[PDB]
Design a protein around this nucleic acid. Structure first.
Ligand SMILES: [Mg+2]
Ligand SMILES: [Mg+2]
Ligand SMILES: [Mg+2]
Ligand SMILES: [Mg+2]
Ligand SMILES: [Mg+2]
Ligand SMILES: [Mg+2]
Ligand SMILES: [Mg+2]
Ligand SMILES: [Mg+2]
Ligand SMILES: [Mg+2]
Ligand SMILES: [Mg+2]
Ligand SMILES: [Mg+2]
Ligand SMILES: [Mg+2]
Ligand SMILES: [Mg+2]
Ligand SMILES: [Mg+2]
Ligand SMILES: [Mg+2]
Ligand SMILES: [Mg+2]
Ligand SMILES: [Mg+2]
Ligand SMILES: [Mg+2]
Ligand SMILES: [Mg+2]
Ligand SMILES: [Mg+2]
Ligand SMILES: [Mg+2]
Ligand SMILES: [Mg+2]
Ligand SMILES: [Mg+2]
Ligand SMILES: [Mg+2]
Ligand SMILES: [Mg+2]
Ligand SMILES: [Mg+2]
Ligand SMILES: [Mg+2]
Ligand SMILES: [Mg+2]
Ligand SMILES: [Mg+2]
Ligand SMILES: [Mg+2]
Ligand SMILES: [Mg+2]
Ligand SMILES: [Mg+2]
Ligand SMILES: [Mg+2]
Ligand SMILES: [Mg+2]
Ligand SMILES: [Mg+2]
Ligand SMILES: [Mg+2]
Ligand SMILES: [Mg+2]
Ligand SMILES: [Mg+2]
Ligand SMILES: [Mg+2]
Ligand SMILES: [Mg+2]
Ligand SMILES: [Mg+2]
Ligand SMILES: [Mg+2]
Ligand SMILES: [Mg+2]
Ligand SMILES: [Mg+2]
Ligand SMILES: [Mg+2]
Ligand SMILES: [Mg+2]
Ligand SMILES: [Mg+2]
Ligand SMILES: [Mg+2]
Ligand SMILES: [Mg+2]
Ligand SMILES: [Mg+2]
Ligand SMILES: [Mg+2]
Ligand SMILES: [Mg+2]
Ligand SMILES: [Mg+2]
Ligand SMILES: [Mg+2]
Ligand SMILES: [Mg+2]
Ligand SMILES: [Mg+2]
Lengths: 256, 126, 203
RNA sequence: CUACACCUGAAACAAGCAAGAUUACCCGCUGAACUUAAGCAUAUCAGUAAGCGGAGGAAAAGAAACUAACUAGGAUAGCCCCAGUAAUGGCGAAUGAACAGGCUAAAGCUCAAAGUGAAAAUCUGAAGUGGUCAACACAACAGAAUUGUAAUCUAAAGGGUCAACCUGAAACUAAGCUCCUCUCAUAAGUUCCUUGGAACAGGACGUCAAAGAGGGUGACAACCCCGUAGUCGGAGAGGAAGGCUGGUGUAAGGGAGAUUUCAAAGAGUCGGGUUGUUUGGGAUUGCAGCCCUAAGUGGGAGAUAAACUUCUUCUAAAGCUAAAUAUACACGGGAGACCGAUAGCGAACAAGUACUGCGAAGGAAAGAUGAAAAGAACUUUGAAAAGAGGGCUAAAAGACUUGAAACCGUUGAGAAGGAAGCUGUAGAAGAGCAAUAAACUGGACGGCGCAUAAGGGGGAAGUACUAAUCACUGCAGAGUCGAUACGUAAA
RNA sequence: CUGACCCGUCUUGAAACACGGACCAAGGAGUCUAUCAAUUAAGCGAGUGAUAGGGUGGAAAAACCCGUCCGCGAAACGAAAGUGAGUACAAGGUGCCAAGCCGCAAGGUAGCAGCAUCACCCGACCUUGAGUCUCCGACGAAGGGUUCGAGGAAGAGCUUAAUU
RNA sequence: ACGUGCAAAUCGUUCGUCAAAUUUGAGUGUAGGGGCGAAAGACUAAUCGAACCAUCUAGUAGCUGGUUCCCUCCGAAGUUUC
RNA sequence: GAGUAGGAGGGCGUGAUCGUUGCCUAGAAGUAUUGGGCGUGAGCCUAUAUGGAGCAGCGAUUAGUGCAGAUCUUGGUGGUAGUAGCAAAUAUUCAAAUGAGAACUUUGAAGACCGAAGUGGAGAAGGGUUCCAUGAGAACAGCAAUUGUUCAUGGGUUACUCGAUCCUAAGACAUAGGUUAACUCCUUGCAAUACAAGAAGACAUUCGUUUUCGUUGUCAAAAGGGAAUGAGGUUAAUAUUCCUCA
RNA sequence: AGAAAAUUUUCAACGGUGGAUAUCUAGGUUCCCGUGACGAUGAAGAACGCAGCGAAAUGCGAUACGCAAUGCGAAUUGCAGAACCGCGAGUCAUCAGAUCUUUGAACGCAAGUGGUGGAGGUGUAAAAACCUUCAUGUUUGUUUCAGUGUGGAA
């Protein structure tokens, strides 16, 4: 976005406007010479003046977009997935996982061929997912202020994200109109869907093809990734993340 | 939504609505058909006409039934017989109504109508 | 102008306001290119996307070690292939008339390329008639309906594995490389004065 | 001398062409100062503004008189690099490209010049005839033209001699597709309660969803209405400055390869000198005047001036050419971490308007009653404005949403002998639906209503251990995938 | 009752007989782009990172994969012609000095990083040279400097964001 | 006199000249480093020792003025050299 | 435990974006408070009143993010103050009438002024409906108004003889020719820096035919030149114009 | 305790001035994509007109807020009068046929003027009045011509 630049100039600059000069017991600011209009003698272009150009007229070429190193995009997506696997975290995100069973939640490709919405619903209901979906439905906000006039009418919290592995699957058309559902093809995943708001951990429902390709795509501390073609997952800083174990063991306390 | 050429802007649409030329307006202000008629023509909604019989579904005037006196498209109003209020000087005046709060009990029938209805039913059931 | 930092290099000295370039079209542009390419395929359907390209060495001393896609085939090469420029063109081959072959091997690569091309070729004449030059292939090939990419069908491999030999070590060890390069550089250096001496002692 | 022919000029008439407009992008010219060098002439700003002449949907550019010297590359244009490099500069300030290499895009063609001379084979108009009748095909007659039209040809060749092998205007005749424009149609609650003037709110029961984008309906409505989705779907009408592809196939038209006493190519132009100007181009960056003024293995170029020897590369002085590229302009589309009536274009509005200036030119202010005018009936006092009654309405919200401050009036509680206000400390008066307060925890016992206790068995789930099993680590047979400067000329 | 000059500003000096301010609302001033550097968090490490562009993809300009070159580092010294971290088995010495190991303690052992110094090395500038050959110009056993360098001597970089 | 006028040059008295180098209407010739001037740097539309309009133009300012919320902590220089 | 210039560390408050937790026709935002409290402080929470549709917290992302000043911008308001002031151009007065109201309107009766270099009768420039009639709330006519150059509604500008139109002037511009990158510019009545440029007649009556004589344009004057009209009468408003007569 | 008022002054409530704040938006602004498509067949612009009741803005041109065709298929609406139920409403849309005054590159000449030439048509006894037509450059031609330009038969 930017402020009008045209033949005439940056907006607010559109007068032939002078500085009256010190003699008049008036401020030195530029005015509009002319006759016959109430605008006459009125202060001319400058921040101070009603009807004048900004402090830093804002430009088009302000560089908004940033570029991330691939390795860090990946490391990010990874740590995101890692997060998605622990109950404390996805619960900590506010998702409703109570009636959900085992995380990762994985299912059969029977799902991938779903067409109508009703069955995607019934599906969520069976799996116990539906609680979370219910929440997206019961908190639906009118956006606070300006946003509405800006073409974003409603604030909706995020629901369950499903990851399917079959390029041609209908789960897409199926889940579509359900508020809060999120569909992704395993081969290409977004930190953005993975960690909405930069907030780690989320409810995911996986396919078989999905879940299996996961490894081929990424790899493991024995092997590199295929799809990422040489990506090695992060090398942990501490094998064991319980400092409990480590402060509290024999070796420690004997010496302590 | 599926199509990039579909304007989602408040502005554009509101504009379309209020800037609606007469013929399009008639469409825009339209009523919902009675269970009976729904079933008869296999059509949910119909644009209103000045000879139709309707039932006010919502308003202080809900529940009343009658003929449509005036479709005043400019004022956005539908008038229904005996839907008027009386003034202290003894002067009667009509009370305007929004179509989408009405229900069509009996249509004004004639060839063009029947053709329209026919097309709607056509895409519907088929 | 204050501290130890490196002397600035002016940028905005002129009026650049008129001279700025913006990259938002890029987004859509990429896309457009895609569809263009695709719509080419569809309109070209039986035929390949990119026309036949010979290969050459790059133009700089540093680039010589590498391989590069040429713009066209050398008339000399079309000759050894047995194609007329015109025909090769009706085939989808790319010809370049200003390029010249100064090496046997450069003939070879492109011959191999051409032949490879022809062998893998299918030619549709006016329906059910057959023809001679570069010839014309059977009506059943019409059913064969090949959509193919040129890199798959007519490619160029090289691997660096350098074979080893001992007898030669025994050999190579008897000369002195440095001394060599030196006396050579030297020879190039003084050649002129030396020839001039020959000429002068001759007259 | 006449008739007549031809060269040259002139008038009227027939049929066609140009004249202005457009501004963003494009072309050819013309061309400064402010500014920076902390002064200032060179320089910089800068080939920039202003000015002029031309276009187009793009323009321009383009098939080498290019690079490079390497095992070379090969039209033009844009992206990335090279690069802030080589160079230019009171070598100060500061200027400043390109080759190679990675991409996008791809395309190549027409003339002059020995050759019809077995014959102007050519071009234009045309009363007319057929036609899809403005656009097509023939056409009696007329002009143009040997101070030369058409076929061969354009250096990558080519002429001449062979020649494998190829092609098809005419006419006749079948079936089709592409693109554009204007129209027509499509799910599912108006069920029930409560608060509302209004239900689009909070509850209860329901539905559709490849439709829960977004709007409108008296309120934050998927299901009331327009829409959204299935829909690069279906149906109807009309289009192409008169879109595109077949099958026979005529007179006729090509040519790989082969050989051959053959083999011809742009002049006051290229080049030079000088003077300006321009470029990084620096003793030959481009261009322009003036003065010289060519050649024909000649002529260009090979980033230092001039010879001399050798090598390399291209053919100038005539033309056409899609794409990738640029668009603050116009009409359209869609969108946005824009703005939100002193903001945002100057203009949300009878805005380039009112108004001013002889004129060139200047140029504002100004958006929201209500769901519906239901816009205040009628009584009374007034000359009239208007007041008091009375009424609409959810409410006067009444020229209108909210309705802050400054300023002003009224009512209340205070205070003051040449100003006021204010830190610290107490007091008095005035205004008050009161924000603090002797409550709270337990033992034993009583009166009430509800539940079922501890302890004991019991022991689902949990944790811990632990053999048998089994994720993971380790070892690791057979199949399939991959890699490999191990190996081979490759395999 | 005690204490109490008008604020903002420039100034050595403001209550000043220095300047702006009668009052109120709304508006109103270190931004944006580029450049190098230092620091902080990130990733990878003798490497690092793409851009352009390709290929996929949500309704969508996102994302996700590819991306033979290129940047910057990895070698320096010279105007340049040019040379290149010279005994293959090297990668040092010394003074300060941390861990680990001894020891109740005193101290002993060891010697990472850094600082100072001496030594070696490549190149600039000097100086010297048996012998060798494609012998007229190059090569090199041995031997050196009062000097010069944004250098060697077991590589520390590259990309991202932020601040100054 | 008025001098926040009746007036961005007026008003009262007074005064120069009053058949010429007189006064005056319209039309027409001269335009900006240019006109035009019995010459005062006068006049050129209240603008003149270089008109007026728009643009380059937010022209540059070693100089004047302003520079917008809280607390806590450390805390200067008016000397050196060019 | 001081502190200007200055620097650092924490925090308060404001939009918008991705998240997360919620509030609102059972009343959001905003607004007023001599209601009750919380922070050392930026600021906060609550209560009551008003208001009548949207809001808020928490983690991040981003910024046109905080005003007492700049003779700061635009808008709105004070004190001065019912003050300075409404005093040039000799003057008004009485009765009646009209009206809610009369020093300021209309008639009459008196007294004065401009004193034919006018305060008279008509034009040019300039104005453009300001003219005529009827009516009239506000505003304006710096007191007033029953009145108007103001507001509303209707109606008014007649020509052979007046003027424009024609003519020529100071002048000016085409055409032709030449100059310019181009735009532009230079010449032209004594007419050309041009030049194969015209007019008339007749028959014909088109052409054509024919004859005659011939170098070639236009604009600029409502006081200059300039074919011919007068008197009387008429309208609310036109008249050397209409009517009548000559 | 000149212990009342008036004045000067603090605070609140209500009223008056005033239009801040909050919430909106048929507006702006920027980005991406699609087409470039004016004119002597008279453009861009200008003047004056055109509604039953109309000034402006917008539309239109003596066929004058509009004709025709086509698609929507019943309104316009501030008042009044008609027209229309399909012989079809409409301030609707679409738009491919018409109307298109005086002008303007602007065109017979001229112009602060509806002035004024030539040719043709009309009108008349003849006039007046009305109407149509005529700009410049250029490429071809057609017709008529000039040249002590070059040739040149009978
Ligand atoms: Mg002053
Ligand atoms: Mg649901
Ligand atoms: Mg484009
Ligand atoms: Mg002739
Ligand atoms: Mg033009
Ligand atoms: Mg500047
Ligand atoms: Mg300076
Ligand atoms: Mg330059
Ligand atoms: Mg055009
Ligand atoms: Mg650069
Ligand atoms: Mg390249
Ligand atoms: Mg014909
Ligand atoms: Mg002829
Ligand atoms: Mg529906
Ligand atoms: Mg009720
Ligand atoms: Mg409901
Ligand atoms: Mg909705
Ligand atoms: Mg659809
Ligand atoms: Mg020049
Ligand atoms: Mg030269
Ligand atoms: Mg050429
Ligand atoms: Mg009343
Ligand atoms: Mg109220
Ligand atoms: Mg008060
Ligand atoms: Mg008192
Ligand atoms: Mg007091
Ligand atoms: Mg008292
Ligand atoms: Mg005191
Ligand atoms: Mg004060
Ligand atoms: Mg003093
Ligand atoms: Mg001062
Ligand atoms: Mg990219
Ligand atoms: Mg390097
Ligand atoms: Mg050491
Ligand atoms: Mg006087
Ligand atoms: Mg100074
Ligand atoms: Mg904002
Ligand atoms: Mg209520
Ligand atoms: Mg808070
Ligand atoms: Mg209330
Ligand atoms: Mg925050
Ligand atoms: Mg403020
Ligand atoms: Mg303020
Ligand atoms: Mg005042
Ligand atoms: Mg006075
Ligand atoms: Mg008088
Ligand atoms: Mg008079
Ligand atoms: Mg008079
Ligand atoms: Mg004259
Ligand atoms: Mg003259
Ligand atoms: Mg006369
Ligand atoms: Mg008469
Ligand atoms: Mg108030
Ligand atoms: Mg009709
Ligand atoms: Mg002509
Ligand atoms: Mg002759």
């Amino acid at each position: 976005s930017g402020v009008k630049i045209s033949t005439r100039g940056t907006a607010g600059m559109g007068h032939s406007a002078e500085s009256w000069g010190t003699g008049r017991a008036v401020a030195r600011i530029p005015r509009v010479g002319g006759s016959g209009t109430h605008r006459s003698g009125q202060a001319a272009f400058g921040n101070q003046c009603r009807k004048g150009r900004m402090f830093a007229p804002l430009k088009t070429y302000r560089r908004v977009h940033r570029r991330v190193n691939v390795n860090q995009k990946r490391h990010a997506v990874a740590a995101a997935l890692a997060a998605s696997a622990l109950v404390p975290l996805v619960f900590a995100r506010g998702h409703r996982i109570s009636n959900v069973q085992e995380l990762p939640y994985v299912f059969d490709d029977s799902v991938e061929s779903y067409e109508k919405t009703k069955q995607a619903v019934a599906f969520l209901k069976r799996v116990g997912a539906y609680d979370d979906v219910l929440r997206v439905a019961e908190t639906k906000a009118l956006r606070a202020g300006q946003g509405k006039l800006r073409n974003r009418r409603y604030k909706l919290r995020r629901g369950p994200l499903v990851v399917y592995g079959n390029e041609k699957s209908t789960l897409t058309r199926a889940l579509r109109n359900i508020p809060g559902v999120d569909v992704c093809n395993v081969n290409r995943l977004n930190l953005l869907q993975l960690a909405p708001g930069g907030h780690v951990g989320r409810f995911i429902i996986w396919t078989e093809s999905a879940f299996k390709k996961l490894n081929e795509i990424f790899g493991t501390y024995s092997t590199t990734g295929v799809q990422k073609s040489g990506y090695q997952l992060q090398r942990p800083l501490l094998a064991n993340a319980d400092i409990a174990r480590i402060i509290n063991s024999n070796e420690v306390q004997s010496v302590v | 939504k599926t199509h990039v050429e579909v304007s989602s802007a408040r502005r554009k649409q509101r504009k379309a609505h209020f800037a609606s030329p007469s013929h399009l307006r008639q469409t825009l202000m339209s009523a919902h058909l009675s269970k009976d008629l729904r079933s008869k023509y296999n059509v949910r909604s119909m644009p209103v006409r000045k000879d139709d019989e309707v039932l006010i579904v919502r308003g202080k005037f809900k529940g009343n039934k009658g003929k449509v006196t005036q479709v005043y498209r400019k004022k956005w109003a539908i008038h229904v017989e005996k839907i008027s209020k009386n003034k202290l000087n003894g002067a009667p005046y009509q009370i305007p109504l929004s179509a989408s709060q009405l229900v069509l009990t009996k249509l004004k029938l004639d060839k063009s109508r029947q053709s329209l209805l026919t097309r709607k039913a056509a895409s519907l059931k088929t | 102008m204050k501290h130890n930092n490196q002397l600035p290099v002016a940028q905005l000295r002129k009026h650049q306001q008129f001279r700025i370039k913006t990259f938002f079209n890029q987004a859509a542009q990429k896309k457009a290119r895609l569809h263009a390419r695709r719509a080419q395929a569809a309109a070209v359907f039986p035929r390949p996307t990119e026309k036949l390209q010979p290969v050459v060495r790059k133009q700089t001393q540093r680039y010589n070690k590498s391989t590069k896609l040429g713009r066209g085939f050398t008339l000399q090469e079309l000759k050894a292939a047995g194609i007329s420029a015109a025909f090769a063109q009706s085939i989808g081959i790319k010809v370049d008339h200003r390029r010249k072959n100064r090496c046997q091997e450069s003939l070879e690569l492109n011959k191999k390329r051409l032949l490879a091309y022809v062998s893998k070729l299918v030619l549709f004449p006016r329906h059910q008639g057959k023809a001679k030059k570069g010839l014309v292939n059977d009506t059943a090939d019409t059913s064969s309906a090949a959509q193919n990419a040129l890199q798959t069908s007519v490619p160029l491999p090289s691997v660096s594995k350098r074979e080893k030999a001992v007898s030669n070590i025994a050999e190579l060890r008897k000369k002195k490389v440095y001394r060599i390069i030196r006396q050579e550089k030297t020879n190039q250096k003084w050649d002129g004065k030396r020839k001039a001496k020959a000429q002068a002692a001759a007259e």
